[PDB]
Write an enzyme that holds these catalytic residues in place. Structure first.
Site, short mmCIF file in Angstrom:
data_model
loop_
_atom_site.label_atom_id
_atom_site.label_comp_id
_atom_site.label_asym_id
_atom_site.label_seq_id
_atom_site.Cartn_x
_atom_site.Cartn_y
_atom_site.Cartn_z
N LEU A 137 0.84 -1.20 0.00
CA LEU A 137 0.00 0.00 0.00
C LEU A 137 0.87 1.25 0.00
O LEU A 137 1.88 1.14 0.68
CB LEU A 137 -0.76 0.05 1.36
N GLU A 169 -9.50 0.24 8.27
CA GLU A 169 -9.81 0.27 6.82
C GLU A 169 -9.78 -1.18 6.31
O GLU A 169 -10.68 -1.65 5.65
CB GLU A 169 -8.79 1.08 6.07
C1 LIG Z 1 -6.65 -8.42 2.89
O1 LIG Z 1 -5.38 -8.16 3.59
C2 LIG Z 1 -4.58 -7.23 2.97
C3 LIG Z 1 -4.75 -6.62 1.73
C4 LIG Z 1 -3.74 -5.71 1.31
C5 LIG Z 1 -3.76 -4.92 -0.01
N1 LIG Z 1 -5.15 -5.05 -0.62
C6 LIG Z 1 -5.24 -5.97 -1.76
C7 LIG Z 1 -6.15 -4.19 -0.24
C8 LIG Z 1 -6.07 -3.49 1.01
N2 LIG Z 1 -7.09 -2.64 1.32
C9 LIG Z 1 -8.13 -2.42 0.52
N3 LIG Z 1 -9.12 -1.60 0.98
C10 LIG Z 1 -10.18 -1.28 0.19
N4 LIG Z 1 -11.14 -0.46 0.64
N5 LIG Z 1 -10.32 -1.87 -0.98
C11 LIG Z 1 -9.37 -2.71 -1.47
N6 LIG Z 1 -9.67 -3.16 -2.69
C12 LIG Z 1 -8.27 -3.03 -0.70
C13 LIG Z 1 -7.26 -3.98 -1.07
C14 LIG Z 1 -2.64 -5.43 2.14
C15 LIG Z 1 -2.49 -6.09 3.34
O2 LIG Z 1 -1.39 -5.79 4.13
C16 LIG Z 1 -0.34 -5.14 3.39
C17 LIG Z 1 -3.43 -6.99 3.76
O3 LIG Z 1 -3.36 -7.64 4.99
C18 LIG Z 1 -4.49 -7.54 5.81
#
Ligand SMILES: COc1cc(CN(C)c2cnc3nc(N)nc(N)c3c2)cc(OC)c1OC
Length: 186
Positions: free
Chosen positions: A22, A30
Site C-alpha cells: 500500500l 480500513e
Molecule cells: C486483505 O489483507 C490485505 C490486503 C492488502 C492490499 N489489498 C489488496 C487491499 C487493502 N485494502 C483495501 N481496501 C479497500 N477499501 N479496498 C481494497 N480493494 C483493498 C485492497 C494489504 C495487506 O497488508 C499489506 C493486507 O493484509 C491484511
C-alpha cells in the site's frame, strides 16, 4: 446471484499501490471494513466471490491468502494455472462472470467483489449493468506506482447513504479517510 461491486482504497492522488504494498502505512479499521464488506452474505450456503488481478493477489501477505470465507478468483492472461491458494483463474472479467453459472458457481455465489487492480477496475467500470463502487478516500497524497481511474461523475452517482457504510470522516495514525458509494446501470 447478487450484484457486481468494486471496492478500492485511494489516496488523493488516486494511488492504490507502491512496489507490491500500500502507498500508506497500515490502517487497521480500513482493513477491517474491506474484510467485512467483502465477506458478509446473510444467505445460507453462499459465499461472495472476490475477483483480483495477479498484482493484487501478490500484494496480500501470504498469511492472508486466500481470503477466508470467500471464493478467490485470479484474473490473468499470463499465469499458466491458478496460483496456490486461489480457486480459479480466468483470462478476462467476461469469462470470470461466465464462470459464475456452470456447475460450481451459480448455486454457490452471492455477491461479486472486484478487489483490484487498475486494469480489472477499468475493465469492470466500463462493463454493462448495475455496478457499485465502494471507495475509501484517503485524504493525503502518497507516492504510488499503481492508480485507480478517474471516476466519471455524472455517469456514476454518489449515494448519500448505504447500509453498513459509515458516513463520518475517520482517522487513524492521523490520516483522515471517508467511505463513499457510487453506482451506475447500463
Ligand atoms: C486483505 O489483507 C490485505 C490486503 C492488502 C492490499 N489489498 C489488496 C487491499 C487493502 N485494502 C483495501 N481496501 C479497500 N477499501 N479496498 C481494497 N480493494 C483493498 C485492497 C494489504 C495487506 O497488508 C499489506 C493486507 O493484509 C491484511
Amino acid at each position: 446471484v447478487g450484484s457486481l461491486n468494486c471496492i478500492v482504497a485511494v489516496s488523493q492522488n488516486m494511488g492504490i499501490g507502491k512496489n507490491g504494498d500500500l502507498p500508506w502505512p497500515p490502517l487497521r479499521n480500513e482493513f477491517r471494513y474491506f474484510q467485512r464488506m467483502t465477506t458478509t452474505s446473510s444467505v445460507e450456503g453462499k459465499q461472495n466471490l472476490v475477483i483480483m488481478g495477479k498484482k493484487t493477489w501478490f500484494s496480500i501477505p501470504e498469511k492472508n491468502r486466500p481470503l477466508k470465507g470467500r471464493i478467490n478468483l485470479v484474473l490473468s492472461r499470463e499465469l499458466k494455472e491458478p496460483p496456490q491458494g486461489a480457486h480459479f483463474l480466468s483470462r478476462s472479467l467476461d469469462d470470470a462472470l461466465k464462470l459464475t453459472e456452470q456447475p460450481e458457481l451459480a448455486n454457490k455465489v452471492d455477491m461479486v467483489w472486484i478487489v483490484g487492480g487498475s486494469s480489472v477496475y477499468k475493465e469492470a467500470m466500463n462493463h454493462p449493468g448495475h455496478l457499485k463502487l465502494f471507495v475509501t478516500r484517503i485524504m493525503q497524497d502518497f507516492e504510488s506506482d499503481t492508480f485507480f481511474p478517474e471516476i466519471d461523475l455524472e455517469k456514476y452517482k454518489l449515494l448519500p447513504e448505504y447500509p453498513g457504510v459509515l458516513s463520518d470522516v475517520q482517522e487513524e495514525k492521523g490520516i483522515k479517510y471517508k467511505f463513499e458509494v457510487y453506482e451506475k446501470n447500463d
